[PDB]
Amino acid sequence: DPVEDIIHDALSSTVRTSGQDVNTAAGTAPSSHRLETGRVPALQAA
Amino acid sequence: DPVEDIIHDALSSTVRTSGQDVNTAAGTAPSSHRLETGRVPALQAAETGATSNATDENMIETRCVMNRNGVLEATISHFFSRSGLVGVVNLTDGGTDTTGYAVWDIDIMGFVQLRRKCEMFTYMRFNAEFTFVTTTENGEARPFMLQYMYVPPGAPKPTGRDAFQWQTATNPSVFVKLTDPPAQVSVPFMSPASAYQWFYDGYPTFGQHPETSNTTYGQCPNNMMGTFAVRVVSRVASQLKLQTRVYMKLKHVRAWIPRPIRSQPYLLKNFPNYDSSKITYSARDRASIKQAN
Amino acid sequence: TNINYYKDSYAASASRQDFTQDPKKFTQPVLDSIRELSAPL
Amino acid sequence: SDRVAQLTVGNSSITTQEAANIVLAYGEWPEYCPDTDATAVDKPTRPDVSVNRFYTLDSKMWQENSTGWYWKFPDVLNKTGVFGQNAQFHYLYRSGFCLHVQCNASKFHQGALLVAVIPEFVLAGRGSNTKPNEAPHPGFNTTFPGTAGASFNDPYVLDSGVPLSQSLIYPHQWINLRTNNCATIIVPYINAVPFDSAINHSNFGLIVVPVSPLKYSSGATTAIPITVTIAPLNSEFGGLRQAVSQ
Amino acid sequence: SDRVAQLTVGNSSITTQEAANIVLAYGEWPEYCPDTDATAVDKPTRPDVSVNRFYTLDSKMWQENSTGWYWKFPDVLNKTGVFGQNAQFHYLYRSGFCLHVQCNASKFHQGALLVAVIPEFVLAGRGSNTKPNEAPHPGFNTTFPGTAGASFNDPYVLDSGVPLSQSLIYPHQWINLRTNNCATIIVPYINAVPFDSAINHSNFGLIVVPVSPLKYSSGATTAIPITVTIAPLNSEFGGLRQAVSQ
Ligand SMILES: CCCCCCCCCCCCC/C=C/[C@H](O)[C@H](N)CO
Numbered sequence: 001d002p003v004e005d006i007i008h009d010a011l012s013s014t015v016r017t018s019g020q021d022v023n024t025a026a027g028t029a030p031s032s033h034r035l036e037t038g039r040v041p042a043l044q045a046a
Numbered sequence: 047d048p049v050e051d052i053i054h055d056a057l058s059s060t061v062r063t064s065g066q067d068v069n070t071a072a073g074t075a076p077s078s079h080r081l082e083t084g085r086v087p088a089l090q091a092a093e094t095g096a097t098s099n100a101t102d103e104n105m106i107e108t109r110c111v112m113n114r115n116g117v118l119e120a121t122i123s124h125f126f127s128r129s130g131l132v133g134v135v136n137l138t139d140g141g142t143d144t145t146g147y148a149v150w151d152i153d154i155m156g157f158v159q160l161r162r163k164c165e166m167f168t169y170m171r172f173n174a175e176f177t178f179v180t181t182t183e184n185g186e187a188r189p190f191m192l193q194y195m196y197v198p199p200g201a202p203k204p205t206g207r208d209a210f211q212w213q214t215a216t217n218p219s220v221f222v223k224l225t226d227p228p229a230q231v232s233v234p235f236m237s238p239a240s241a242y243q244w245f246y247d248g249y250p251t252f253g254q255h256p257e258t259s260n261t262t263y264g265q266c267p268n269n270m271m272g273t274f275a276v277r278v279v280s281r282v283a284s285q286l287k288l289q290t291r292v293y294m295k296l297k298h299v300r301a302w303i304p305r306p307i308r309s310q311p312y313l314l315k316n317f318p319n320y321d322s323s324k325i326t327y328s329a330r331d332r333a334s335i336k337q338a339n
Numbered sequence: 340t341n342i343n344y345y346k347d348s349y350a351a352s353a354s355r356q357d358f359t360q361d362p363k364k365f366t367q368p369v370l371d372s373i374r375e376l377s378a379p380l
Numbered sequence: 381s382d383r384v385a386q387l388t389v390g391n392s393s394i395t396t397q398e399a400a401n402i403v404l405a406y407g408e409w410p411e412y413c414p415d416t417d418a419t420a421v422d423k424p425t426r427p428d429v430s431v432n433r434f435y436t437l438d439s440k441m442w443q444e445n446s447t448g449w450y451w452k453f454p455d456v457l458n459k460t461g462v463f464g465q466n467a468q469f470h471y472l473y474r475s476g477f478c479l480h481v482q483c484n485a486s487k488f489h490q491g492a493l494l495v496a497v498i499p500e501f502v503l504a505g506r507g508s509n510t511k512p513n514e515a516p517h518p519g520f521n522t523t524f525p526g527t528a529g530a531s532f533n534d535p536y537v538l539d540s541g542v543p544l545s546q547s548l549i550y551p552h553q554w555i556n557l558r559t560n561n562c563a564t565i566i567v568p569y570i571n572a573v574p575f576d577s578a579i580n581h582s583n584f585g586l587i588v589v590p591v592s593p594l595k596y597s598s599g600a601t602t603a604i605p606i607t608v609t610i611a612p613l614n615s616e617f618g619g620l621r622q623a624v625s626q
Numbered sequence: 627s628d629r630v631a632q633l634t635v636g637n638s639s640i641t642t643q644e645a646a647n648i649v650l651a652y653g654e655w656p657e658y659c660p661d662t663d664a665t666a667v668d669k670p671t672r673p674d675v676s677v678n679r680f681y682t683l684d685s686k687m688w689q690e691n692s693t694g695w696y697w698k699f700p701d702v703l704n705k706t707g708v709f710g711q712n713a714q715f716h717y718l719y720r721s722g723f724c725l726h727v728q729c730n731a732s733k734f735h736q737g738a739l740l741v742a743v744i745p746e747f748v749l750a751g752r753g754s755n756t757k758p759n760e761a762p763h764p765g766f767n768t769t770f771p772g773t774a775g776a777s778f779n780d781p782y783v784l785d786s787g788v789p790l791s792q793s794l795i796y797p798h799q800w801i802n803l804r805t806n807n808c809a810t811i812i813v814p815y816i817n818a819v820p821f822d823s824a825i826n827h828s829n830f831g832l833i834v835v836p837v838s839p840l841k842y843s844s845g846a847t848t849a850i851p852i853t854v855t856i857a858p859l860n861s862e863f864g865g866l867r868q869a870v871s872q
Pocket of ligand 1: 152153154155174176194195196218219220231233236242269270271274
């Protein structure tokens with residue numbers, strides 16, 4: 001109110017990866033062939 | 047219905063930037079750091095001809111400023127509100143000069159300081175406020191009387207001191223004394239066109255046009271608007287060397303199509319001719335590139 | 340409040356000053372009105 | 381998704397793939413003469429297809445020491461096209477142009493080009509003499525070059541005593557050989573009168589200035605041309621009469 | 627749509643157009659010291675603008691037989707900047723850095739660079755002698771090189787007896803001259819104590835290793851530099867006292 005610049009950041013100075021509990025190994029589901037463009041998990045960017 | 051092609055475009059021949067009223071300067075709100083991809087206001091493309099909108103909030107850690115600086119004085123209405131010199135006449139009424147009158151065609155291009163202002167806008171429309179200051183060559187005022195007749199295009203121009211044109215039963219005239227505060231007159235927009243033109247990419251007439259000397263080029267008459275004459279009110283000559291400056295103001299001005307400012311010096315009146323031998327570079331010459339004074 | 344002592348219109352001085360500015364006519368005279376902080380190309 | 385562009389007027393259909401962003405002069409589309417302002421009491425004519433085509437002017441080659449070129453409108457179209465045969469037969473005229481200029485170069489070349497329309501683009505006698513009866517003046521073919529388009533003599537002042545540095549107040553678009561090989565402008569009818577003559581009063585000019593000089597390492601295409609394709613929109617014609625060449 | 631990047635901290639505003647993907651060390655933003663854990667009973671100071679700027683270190687040239695470089699933090703900033711004059715006047719300190727390193731190259735060049743922060747990056751005496759009183763040890767300027775940043779002697783073991791092959795457990799980002807000319811890291815305050823000294827305890831290191839050697843066909847730019855721009859976030863300072871150089 002006297003000046004917005006000091007109350008703006010202080011209000012926005014609040015706190016800025018909820019991993020689960022893995023009991024066993026990771027299973028897998030089936031998967032069929034998929035012949036489509038645009039969707040690729042191989043060509044990543046390490 | 048008889049054929050769709052004619053009713054389609056006619057129905058779709060209808061009319062195909064709602065800017066706000068800015069009273070003050072533009073304020074600013076704060077802004078914090080933002081570390082994200084995809085969103086960038088710096089890397090614009092000035093090649094599209096657009097202005098980059100890299101606002102101050104979007105570059106740095108700005109603050110909150112509620113500005114108050116007035117923009118009233120920067121508008122065109124108060125930019126041309128200043129009066130300024132236009133012409134001088136030389137009514138050399140003496141023993142040798144047996145004329146007693148001096149005619150001067152209105153051309154504001156004759157003097158640079160008012161010229162360079164109106165060159166910034168290609169088409170203008172305004173009403174004028176002329177002011178005829180009056181004095182002798184010595185700056186002295188005397189007990190005499192003058193006549194100031196406007197002679198439109200087509201009117202008979204005066205021929206001498208006792209001419210019949212000074213009967214002025216239709217031409218507007220200003221009868222004023224020389225011991226008087228300056229005469230002042232408002233003048234309307236008396237163009238035959240809808241707006242004045244300081245430029246004309248062509249010729250007034252049709253037909254052939256030579257390539258050796260083109261004196262008719264760039265002379266539109268819609269702005270060319272007649273003459274303006276003066277005499278001393280007397281049938282016999284009084285020996286005095288007179289020289290009256292004429293000043294004008296521009297009011298109710300409406301500009302159009304802004305034009306860059308002329309940097310080169312002027313050489314003629316109705317033609318913007320510069321000189322190839324002396325190109326006046328706009329910027330002053332520095333020492334080297336990395337030596338900001 | 341400004342007043343004219345003549346029955347003509349062109350004897351007034353500052354009969355209506357006006358704040359009206361449109362930077363979009365000159366600064367951004369673009370068909371595709373680009374976004375304010377995005378990539379233009 | 382924005383680099384492509386498809387403009388089609390009349391039977392023509394132009395496309396440019398690398399150039400992007402149409403710039404519209406002063407934010408007003410070209411429109412016909414409204415009823416409440418026209419003065420030509422007779423009916424004007426609206427062909428709208430024969431004339432509204434993309435006429436292509438001649439190619440101008442760009443050299444490493446080039447200076448510039450310029451044209452005048454609608455002066456470039458009075459001998460060619462149905463629009464030429466329509467302007468020679470009519471005293472009055474109104475139209476709005478869709479400029480479009482092309483300069484193709486490789487991704488190894490460099491250079492830039494300033495493209496801008498100049499309303500009421502008068503020229504200036506190049507001489508220090510101020511004698512009114514012996515004043516230098518530009519010739520007719522110099523100020524009305526026609527379909528070919530003449531070159532500049534000193535582009536830094538636009539051959540009019542106006543510095544090129546301030547020349548971006550006018551509607552413009554930059555060709556730059558790293559990102560766009562082409563440019564385009566859609567300009568309305570700019571004239572203080574609703575109609576005008578077509579073979580006397582040119583409404584505006586166009587300038588194509590090599591600001592940054594074409595520079596390429598030796599071993600590539602040396603002859604870079606520049607073509608301009610022009611297209612009037614919402615043309616008008618009135619006051620039919622005999623032919624008039626000039 | 628993802629290749630551009632705009633980071634602006636303080637009065638600075640950095641942009642990179644070809645590099646993509648900010649990597650945040652360990653998934654926690656930099657935050658101030660919480661109330662329930664601090665020990666410095668006096669009030670600490672939060673300038674937040676003067677110090678939180680993008681200070682740019684010196685350029686290090688990359689040669690075809692180069693080995694590597696490294697720096698230490700916040701040691702690189704103790705003589706320069708208001709942050710330097712703030713660390714010399716305070717016993718305690720806490721901040722979180724926004725690393726950013728740049729290596730520009732052409733699309734005809736090749737090469738890669740491993741960029742990684744190394745927490746508590748100690749070094750190692752290079753010698754087979756195990757005599758405790760005659761043990762080889764790194765000098766002060768070798769372990770605290772300052773704003774310049776020294777080079778490696780054997781990068782395959784990081785000059786610490788740790789193989790570079792496993793060095794990607796740490797937060798890292800690869801510069802590779804085919805797809806990105808730049809990289810960036812946002813690292814929080816990593817220290818077993820809430821505050822620490824600034825001219826004694828360096829919180830972490832940074833390494834820039836030429837894994838793949840710069841190789842270019844002859845006839846191109848031979849001098850490739852590397853610049854690193856660094857920017858602390860959420861800085862703290864406490865325990866004011868006299869100046870202390872080192
Ligand atoms: C008896 C009253 C005398 C004053 C009246 C003189 C006529 C004034 C008409 C003003 C016309 C517009 C201003 C003129 C500008 C330039 O002379 C022309 N546009 C072209 O040179």
